Amino acid sequence: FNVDVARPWLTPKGGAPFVLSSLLHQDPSTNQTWLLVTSPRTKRTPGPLHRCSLVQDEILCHPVEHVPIPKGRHRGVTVVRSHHGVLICIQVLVRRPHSLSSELTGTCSLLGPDLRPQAQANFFDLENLLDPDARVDTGDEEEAGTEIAIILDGSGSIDPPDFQRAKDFISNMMRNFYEKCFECNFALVQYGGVIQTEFDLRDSQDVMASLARVQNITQVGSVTKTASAMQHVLDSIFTSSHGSRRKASKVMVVLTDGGIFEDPLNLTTVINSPKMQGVERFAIGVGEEFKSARTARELNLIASDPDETHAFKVTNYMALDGLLSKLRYNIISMEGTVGDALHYQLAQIGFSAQILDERQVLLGAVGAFDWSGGALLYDTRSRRGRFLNQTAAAAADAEAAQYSYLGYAVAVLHKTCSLSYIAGAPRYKHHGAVFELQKEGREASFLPVLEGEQMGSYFGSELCPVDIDMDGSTDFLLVAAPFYHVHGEEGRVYVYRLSEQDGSFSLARILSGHPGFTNARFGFAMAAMGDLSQDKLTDVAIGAPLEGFGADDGASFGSVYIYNGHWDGLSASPSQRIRASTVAPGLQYFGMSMAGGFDISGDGLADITVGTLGQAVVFRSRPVVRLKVSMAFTPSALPIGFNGVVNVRLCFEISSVTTASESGLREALLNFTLDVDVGKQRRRLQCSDVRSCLGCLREWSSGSQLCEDLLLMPTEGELCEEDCFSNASVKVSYQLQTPEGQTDHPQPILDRYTEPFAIFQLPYEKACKNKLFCVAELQLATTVSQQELVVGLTKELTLNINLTNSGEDSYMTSMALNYPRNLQLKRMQKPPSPNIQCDDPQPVASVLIMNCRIGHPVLKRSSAHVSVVWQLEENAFPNRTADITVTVTNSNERRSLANETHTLQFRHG
Amino acid sequence: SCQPAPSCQKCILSHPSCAWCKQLNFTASGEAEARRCARREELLARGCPLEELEEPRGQQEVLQDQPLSQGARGEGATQLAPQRVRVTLRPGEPQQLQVRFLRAEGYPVDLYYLMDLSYSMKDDLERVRQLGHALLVRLQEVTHSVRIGFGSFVDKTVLPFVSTVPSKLRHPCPTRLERCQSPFSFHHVLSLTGDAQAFEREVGRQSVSGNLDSPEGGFDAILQAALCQEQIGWRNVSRLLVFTSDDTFHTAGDGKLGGIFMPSDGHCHLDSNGLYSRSTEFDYPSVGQVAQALSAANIQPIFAVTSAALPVYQELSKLIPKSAVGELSEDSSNVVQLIMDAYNSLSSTVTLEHSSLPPGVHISYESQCEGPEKREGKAEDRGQCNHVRINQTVTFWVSLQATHCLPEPHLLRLRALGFSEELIVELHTLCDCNCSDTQPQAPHCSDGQGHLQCGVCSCAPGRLGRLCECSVAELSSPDLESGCGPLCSGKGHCQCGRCSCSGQSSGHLC
Ligand SMILES: *[C@@H]1O[C@H](CO)[C@@H](O[C@@H]2O[C@H](CO)[C@@H](O[C@@H]3O[C@H](CO)[C@@H](O)[C@H](O)[C@@H]3O)[C@H](O)[C@H]2NC(C)=O)[C@H](O)[C@H]1NC(C)=O
Ligand SMILES: [Ca+2]
Numbered sequence A: 001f002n003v004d005v006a007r008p009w010l011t012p013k014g015g016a017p018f019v020l021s022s023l024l025h026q027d028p029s030t031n032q033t034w035l036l037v038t039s040p041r042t043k044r045t046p047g048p049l050h051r052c053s054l055v056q057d058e059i060l061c062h063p064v065e066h067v068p069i070p071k072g073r074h075r076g077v078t079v080v081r082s083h084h085g086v087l088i089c090i091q092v093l094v095r096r097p098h099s100l101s102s103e104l105t106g107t108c109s110l111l112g113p114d115l116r117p118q119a120q121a122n123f124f125d126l127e128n129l130l131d132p133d134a135r136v137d138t139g140d141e142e143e144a145g146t147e148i149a150i151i152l153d154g155s156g157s158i159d160p161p162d163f164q165r166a167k168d169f170i171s172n173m174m175r176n177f178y179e180k181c182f183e184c185n186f187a188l189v190q191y192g193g194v195i196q197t198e199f200d201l202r203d204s205q206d207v208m209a210s211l212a213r214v215q216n217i218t219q220v221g222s223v224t225k226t227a228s229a230m231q232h233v234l235d236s237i238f239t240s241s242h243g244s245r246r247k248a249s250k251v252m253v254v255l256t257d258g259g260i261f262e263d264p265l266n267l268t269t270v271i272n273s274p275k276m277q278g279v280e281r282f283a284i285g286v287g288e289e290f291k292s293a294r295t296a297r298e299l300n301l302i303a304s305d306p307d308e309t310h311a312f313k314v315t316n317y318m319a320l321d322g323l324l325s326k327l328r329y330n331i332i333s334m335e336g337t338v339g340d341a342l343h344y345q346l347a348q349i350g351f352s353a354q355i356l357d358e359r360q361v362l363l364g365a366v367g368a369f370d371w372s373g374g375a376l377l378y379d380t381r382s383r384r385g386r387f388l389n390q391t392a393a394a395a396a397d398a399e400a401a402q403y404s405y406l407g408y409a410v411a412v413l414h415k416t417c418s419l420s421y422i423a424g425a426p427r428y429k430h431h432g433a434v435f436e437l438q439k440e441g442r443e444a445s446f447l448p449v450l451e452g453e454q455m456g457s458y459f460g461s462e463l464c465p466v467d468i469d470m471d472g473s474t475d476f477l478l479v480a481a482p483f484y485h486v487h488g489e490e491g492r493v494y495v496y497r498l499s500e501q502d503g504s505f506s507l508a509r510i511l512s513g514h515p516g517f518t519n520a521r522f523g524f525a526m527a528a529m530g531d532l533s534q535d536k537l538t539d540v541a542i543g544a545p546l547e548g549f550g551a552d553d554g555a556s557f558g559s560v561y562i563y564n565g566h567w568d569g570l571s572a573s574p575s576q577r578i579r580a581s582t583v584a585p586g587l588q589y590f591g592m593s594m595a596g597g598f599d600i601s602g603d604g605l606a607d608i609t610v611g612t613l614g615q616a617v618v619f620r621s622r623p624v625v626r627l628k629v630s631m632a633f634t635p636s637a638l639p640i641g642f643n644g645v646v647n648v649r650l651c652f653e654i655s656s657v658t659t660a661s662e663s664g665l666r667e668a669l670l671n672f673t674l675d676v677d678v679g680k681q682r683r684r685l686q687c688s689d690v691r692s693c694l695g696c697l698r699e700w701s702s703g704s705q706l707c708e709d710l711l712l713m714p715t716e717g718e719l720c721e722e723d724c725f726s727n728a729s730v731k732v733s734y735q736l737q738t739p740e741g742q743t744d745h746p747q748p749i750l751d752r753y754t755e756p757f758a759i760f761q762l763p764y765e766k767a768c769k770n771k772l773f774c775v776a777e778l779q780l781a782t783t784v785s786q787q788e789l790v791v792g793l794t795k796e797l798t799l800n801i802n803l804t805n806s807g808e809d810s811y812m813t814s815m816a817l818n819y820p821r822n823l824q825l826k827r828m829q830k831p832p833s834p835n836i837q838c839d840d841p842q843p844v845a846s847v848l849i850m851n852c853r854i855g856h857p858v859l860k861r862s863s864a865h866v867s868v869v870w871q872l873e874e875n876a877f878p879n880r881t882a883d884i885t886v887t888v889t890n891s892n893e894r895r896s897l898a899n900e901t902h903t904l905q906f907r908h909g
Numbered sequence B: 001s002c003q004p005a006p007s008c009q010k011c012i013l014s015h016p017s018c019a020w021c022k023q024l025n026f027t028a029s030g031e032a033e034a035r036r037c038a039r040r041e042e043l044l045a046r047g048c049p050l051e052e053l054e055e056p057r058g059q060q061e062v063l064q065d066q067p068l069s070q071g072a073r074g075e076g077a078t079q080l081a082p083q084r085v086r087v088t089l090r091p092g093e094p095q096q097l098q099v100r101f102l103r104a105e106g107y108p109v110d111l112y113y114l115m116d117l118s119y120s121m122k123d124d125l126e127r128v129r130q131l132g133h134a135l136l137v138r139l140q141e142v143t144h145s146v147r148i149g150f151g152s153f154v155d156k157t158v159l160p161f162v163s164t165v166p167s168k169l170r171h172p173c174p175t176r177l178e179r180c181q182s183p184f185s186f187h188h189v190l191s192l193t194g195d196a197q198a199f200e201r202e203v204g205r206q207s208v209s210g211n212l213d214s215p216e217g218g219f220d221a222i223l224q225a226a227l228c229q230e231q232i233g234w235r236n237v238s239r240l241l242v243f244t245s246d247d248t249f250h251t252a253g254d255g256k257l258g259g260i261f262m263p264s265d266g267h268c269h270l271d272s273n274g275l276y277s278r279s280t281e282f283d284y285p286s287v288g289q290v291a292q293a294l295s296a297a298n299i300q301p302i303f304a305v306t307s308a309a310l311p312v313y314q315e316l317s318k319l320i321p322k323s324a325v326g327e328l329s330e331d332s333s334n335v336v337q338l339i340m341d342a343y344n345s346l347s348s349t350v351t352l353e354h355s356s357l358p359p360g361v362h363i364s365y366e367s368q369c370e371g372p373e374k375r376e377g378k379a380e381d382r383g384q385c386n387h388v389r390i391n392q393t394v395t396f397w398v399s400l401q402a403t404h405c406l407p408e409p410h411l412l413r414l415r416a417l418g419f420s421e422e423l424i425v426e427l428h429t430l431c432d433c434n435c436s437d438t439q440p441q442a443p444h445c446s447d448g449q450g451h452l453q454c455g456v457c458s459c460a461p462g463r464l465g466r467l468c469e470c471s472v473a474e475l476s477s478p479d480l481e482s483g484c485g486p487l488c489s490g491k492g493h494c495q496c497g498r499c500s501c502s503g504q505s506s507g508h509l510c
């Protein structure tokens, strides 16, 4: 139809603006149309939004500045536009530093109609901007972690029994630390006298294995070299060679009993190192030698003790569990509680969006409250919003609403003098549903108004409110279930008629794709394309991105269906089906997105864009023309035996009001097909030249009128044996033949909903008082031999009908005898004078119609006489009403009707 | 019923009851050569004998029909007979196909165990790592060649499905003192094998895992098990897929929440380690996609789910033919009896389905599966029988109906659901007529140039007539109809130039 598939515009396939979605945006001040496309961020293109223009027969895309910049992985971009501006939201991950959770919501920016910034909004910490009393109108990854190193002495002064106690204390401390801490590992070395490396924090991932490794230690014992142990810890344990985190909190735990002796390194040397510009150190010096000698000062130098928090002097290993709690208190991390209720952390606000007006937007929140869903009604200037959801009345229905995904799709229904927000919940009760915000008092909640019927079909994932006649009030709502299953994932669109009195929904129609495609995903994308067909009625495009998937040689797949809106609703069948194969090679998922209603090619007619996964396709709309034909027969009445030239003055005229078709029939060609005497088996008229009534490709170019001069001749002598008393009907069958190639301007297309033929009739002057019609009266005077009887006394029931014609002339008159099938004719008698033909049909089970072919144009003012002798066909019937009706039908221009009835009564039940 | 037609081909295409006659110019008694298309009696009584009329009737010929044999020991069991038939049907005529199905005993079965590992299945895994020997022994009672495999799934490893915190990605468990593995989407752990020791060892090597949201990515695992035939190890025997979970599943539109726009492409994506590593690049499969893949692979899913998840999988099994749903215990302690009950309820049922009918062709079934005389009603899209016993042979009556014509011999592929056995129907349409009466430029019909091209002799363009003898005498004179009754009394119908009667009365006198 309108869409000019032969000349599309494509963005380059190199994926510079790798297209996820595409829409057309117009500024209603300068009438400037753009081709905003959304892309996933990469190294080449970081921007989420680009603006594309048709320059020099090519789509050139430029990034739109002042929009939020995605970071890292692609998480989701939504862009919606209205006459109030363009709204773009990106899903942003924010990780809480002191928590094992994460926030996943949207950072939105509102642009003006000229793509200039208006407002910015991030919905992290949503409870701050959540004022619930604002009445709704409704028209009324680096890891910080923690790393702990334990230095366990194993000198010869320690007996083997004490080694077991120290090992058990170390294991218990590690277990309690793992209980209270999560993102924090352990490592240790054996401070026995030979510097050996035990399991490091690389092996600390497997906690159970680390416990066994700790339990598998053995004390050798050479000499207490504390400084060497610290230096080895610095060189191996805390170095990133085995995965140590650079910014991890480093805690040193030293439990020693013997002072430094035979140590080449100095204790004061290893502590004053440049790498120790902030490191936690602890010294739990069990031993009476510390209390009784100078080596207490050695203990103090081991670990800094500003408040004596690190210094832990104990008398024996039996109190290790006694001071384990104190040791845990100042080292453990108290990381944020994990398992808190999911209210707004993963609400994903801005998943779907809708601009309500200049300052207000409607943002979907799929993940709020355990993925129950919702919608944020946000005012961008006051920076305050309120949350709308199902508002369950208990704890059973709060859990029953979870994972319903409300706010997956959000739309607005426009009414006489009020608005109505709607939201889709594509897995509500596993079918999907459409919720509508119904206000009462000051609390507004989404209640279900429509539901799906198939499990997993995703009913309500796509919402398309359609206002057909553009009066400001939506007439239809299109709801898609794109994964509807018959044999594969076919797709289904539900058309709902909005009631004008209250706003209720009635299922008008169910739409489907072309048969023979088990995988289509019909309805995955739908949009109101404005007016494409130039009839001032909104039309709809529905994409099926999976049609033809799995084709050989990597063929393009996907389809778009165009539905023209009529005064009674949408079309029964799509006017157009644009397959990706006929657009361009290598188009994957053609039909993922669509938008239209604005002129981007400069021709003045609004055209569309279709987004594939990776590219955006732009199609221009063709002008629509409707022609008006007219004959001007010169004789205007064929005389008796004319045998003369009949002059024809065909004159095609452009009846369309689509201005002047710009380079339209300037290049397209009209194609006539004159069908003289259509319907008659033996035509009594034919064209003088047989080459001007089979196909005639004439060039129109300039001018709104194309006139011709044809000629009609009789056929092979034109004997009047046929029905000369009937108008000869001639059918003009025009057609449009577009050229081949890339035309600079779109070529016109005939209107699909106007029939392209112009049947005209020239009348034979019927020989009568008025030589344009012969009307005669068919009077009948049938006589009944006997009115009725029963029980074999009927014998041969007899009837007699005599048809009398005494008017001007009777032409192909008809008979009609209506008698019940309870009686049957043994013999039938024809009217002798004259031998008038009568094609009597067989009896019928229903009310009898003996449409006998009496009359014929030859019929003079004579009369007929038909004799009928009936007998019951082994049937007995009681008294009835309306008796037997006989009708005479004349097929002239003026119809004369004759009616006759008999009397029937027998007195025998 | 039947009306006068120009030629034999159009006459037979008009109605199945037409009985076009081909006698050598016996219409040389004042009759137009276009009224030889009526029923059998009106053409047998009117001139031509049994030899000189051709009423074409379609037929079916069996190409290969091997007998229903129960292999040797579950080895070469043939269950569907016949296996290739050629059906030629005249438009408008029924064609009855007799399809027999035998439930051979000891038919081999492959059972792939596809487990959920979302930390609510810790005790379930503890039981399953020992239940392998019991499962193999119990399944060996109904069949002799049984092979079992193991797989697992958690979810797609992106937000909001699993917590992608690096510390919570290595250890997705609430506490660090217990052993568990990082979340994955589908890990093919064990290929279908006949020894239970490998099952025990491989499943015991596995650990529990965890994710963030309640629904799981089990559809990805189901699709990858159905598609990756070489890696799973499926054979051409009955295939069971035991799907055990205690929560719902993600469907095709759910991946958009994680920024996943690419539809699942229906290709095998298992790497060398058995992992479905590129699962974050495709969305979840849909119910329709999963059902199509399962039907195309002849795999019968068994959903062993808990009581809280039962209705969802009941709906899903209503959407999937040849599926079973059982109620799983909180620790999978009843999974073997559940599997046995599901397998018995699946084997007791026999279904016959058609691949795809060509335009204008209709199919109907008559499930005669108890008693050689008792058959149920017609007009169904499936040859369904339940409670079929071992060694019992069922019968299906498949009726084929073509309306206009079929240009190409489209192959029909009737098959029994859950079995690789197939019945190929070569569907030709007998809508061309060969009465053999046609002779090129026959001297007997017409004059000089021109050929009959049909049973009726085609008039030569040089002159009009039966043999071009009379251009207008035979064509124009209507006295031949006016001869049509006396003494017929209505019990006999009129004949052109005569009155035809029946019931011991005949001829114009009748
Ligand atoms: C619709 O949204 C409202 C909020 O706009 C949800 O109400 C909130 O529900 C949560 C629970 O999911 C409540 O948190 C709990 O509050 C109780 C006290 O009532 C407390 O004991 C718990 O520890 C927890 O904090 C929250 O208070 C409540 N807020 C309000 C204003 O009602 C509601 O659940 C949503 N409905 C659905 C169906 O999703
Ligand atoms: Ca469990």
Ligand SMILES: [Ca+2]
Residues within 6 Å of the ligand: B154, B155, B161, B162, B211, B212, B213, B214, B215, B216, B217
């Ligand atoms: Ca999950």
Ligand SMILES: [Mg+2]
Residues within 6 Å of the ligand: B118, B120, B214, B216, B246, B247
């Ligand atoms: Mg779970």
